[PDB]
């Protein structure tokens, strides 16, 4: 009754062009079984949304990667937020919510915007740049480590650590094995920066540690919560901004609309998140037998959610394969949905908005002018290199 498919959603061929296989996954049925990894899969919007919004049945504390923490040791101590269920999830989540709050955004917005404008001005002096290394990576590197309160030395470990975290949600394929083999120096740096004396006053890290006296978290929970921001807070935005620039480079008509109304910047970024879905997948584990989309799934089963596929499901979206900066994007699952929905989404949206605003005001054209190279990761979708020529307005 449940169709069995041999598609490997973690293979390099799939990463290179996931869209045909994602349609096959959606059209085979609401629930599929992936024989390659012995997991259930849901690729339509309806079932992805339903799974995300039932955390009791589809839990996170047994891991949101392939590995079931009831069967295997986690590769690092579990995240106190991503890999926790309510009620243990609730108070750490509230702390991160307040650390990454509107008031925090108000304190950092002017500096984030100035850094975005400065980066675009700098890139316009060069003309021909790599929109990944020189923009999607360089801009978040110029604002987020400082906003965390990190020292200068050792920041080169941040992107390798995040690549490792996101590869480690995947199955035990070569991408995951190689990441773990190389992990020790990045893990050592990241864990050390999580300690209170190593986080500069006023930054996100110090603010987490300051919350350790309200009864929401204890001092021994603060380092792992800093670790969450150092895991998820940089490489996601690199791939979100890279997605937006890649969309604007491919769809010049949308760049022209954005130039004509720079207040569309925030929605242009949100649409890029839906369109590319830089965070492609997460798993849940069933805590009981459950009926989902007419199919019966037993207890203790891994369920793979295709967030990118849900964001392109024609059952939910009109013209899902078109990039449309005025689309009503509310309800997309690129940041998740429900109790675990991205706690950092205000930081991500701030960065994406101010960068797209800078481009909207300063750049007349974005033309791909070199070979495009894709980056392969078990969870992240994005480019390694995006050579573009920027023409000034
Ligand atoms: C475009 C950028 C980003 C995307 C696409 C993204 C995506 C996601 C998704 C899909 C989830 C849901 C996880 C789940 O349901 O299991 C999530 C959660 C999370 N994100 Fe984001 N994220 C982004 C940026 C950020 C930033 C900038 C931060 C921190 C500064 C951050 C920190 C977190 C944390 C800590 C969680 C776990 C929340 C929880 O479990 O309650 N993310 N993110
Ligand atoms: C969205 O991806 C992540 C990755 C890691 C963490 C974490 O370490 O808590 C949270 C979200
Ligand atoms: Cl670690």
Automatic annotation (TrEMBL):
Binding site for heme b: 89, 93, 284, 340, 342
Keyword Heme (UniProt): yes
Protein's UniProt keywords contain Cell inner membrane: no
Gene3D superfamilies membership: Cytochrome P450
InterPro entries: Cyt_P450, Cyt_P450_B, Cyt_P450_CS, Cyt_P450_sf
Top-rank taxon: Bacteria
Cofactor names: heme
Keyword annotations from UniProtKB, A to Z: Heme, Iron, Metal-binding, Monooxygenase, Oxidoreductase
Single GO term (MF): monooxygenase activity
Record-stated family: Belongs to the cytochrome P450 family.
Protein name: Cytochrome P450
Organism, as annotated: Rhodopseudomonas palustris (strain HaA2)
Taxonomic classification: Bacteria, Pseudomonadati, Pseudomonadota, Alphaproteobacteria, Hyphomicrobiales
């Amino acid at each position: 009754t449940i169709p069995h498919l041999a598609i490997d959603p973690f293979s390099l061929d799939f990463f290179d062009d996931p869209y045909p296989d994602q349609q096959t996954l959606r059209d085979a049925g609401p629930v599929v079984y992936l024989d390659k990894w012995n997991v259930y899969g849901v690729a339509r919007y309806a079932e992805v949304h339903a799974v995300l919004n039932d955390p009791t049945t589809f839990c996170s504390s047994r891991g949101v990667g392939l590995s079931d923490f009831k069967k295997e040791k986690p590769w690092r101590p579990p995240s106190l937020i991503l890999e926790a269920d309510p009620p243990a999830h609730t108070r750490p989540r509230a702390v991160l919510s307040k650390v990454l709050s509107p008031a925090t955004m108000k304190t950092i917005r002017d500096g984030f915007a100035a850094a975005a404008d400065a980066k675009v001005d700098e890139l316009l002096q060069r003309g021909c740049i790599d929109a990944i290394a020189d923009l999607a990576e360089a801009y978040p590197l110029s604002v987020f480590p400082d906003a965390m309160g990190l020292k200068q030395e050792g920041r080169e470990h941040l992107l390798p650590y995040a690549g490792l975290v996101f590869n480690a949600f995947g199955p035990p394929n070569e991408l995951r094995q190689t990441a773990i083999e190389r992990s020790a120096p990045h893990q050592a740096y990241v864990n050390e920066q999580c300690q209170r004396p190593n986080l500069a006053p006023g930054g996100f890290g110090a603010c987490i540690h300051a919350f350790t006296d309200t009864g929401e978290i204890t001092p021994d929970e603060a380092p792992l919560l800093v670790r969450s921001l150092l895991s998820a807070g940089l490489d996601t935005t690199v791939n979100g901004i890279g997605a937006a620039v890649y969309c604007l480079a491919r769809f010049p008509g949308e760049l022209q609309r954005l130039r004509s109304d720079p207040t569309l910047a925030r929605n242009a970024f949100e649409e890029a998140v839906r369109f590319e879905s830089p965070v492609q997948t997460f798993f849940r584990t069933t805590t009981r037998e459950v009926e989902l989309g007419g199919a019966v799934i037993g207890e203790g089963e891994k369920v793979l959610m295709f967030l990118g596929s849900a964001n392109r499901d024609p059952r939910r979206w009109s013209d899902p394969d078109l990039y449309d900066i005025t689309r009503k994007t509310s309800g997309h699952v690129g940041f998740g949905s429900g109790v675990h929905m991205c706690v950092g989404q205000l930081v991500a949206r701030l960065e994406g908005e101010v960068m797209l605003s800078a481009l909207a005001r300063k750049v007349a054209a974005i033309d791909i002018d070199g070979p495009v190279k894709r980056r392969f990761n078990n969870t992240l979708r994005g480019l390694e290199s995006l050579p573009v020529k920027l023409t000034p307005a």
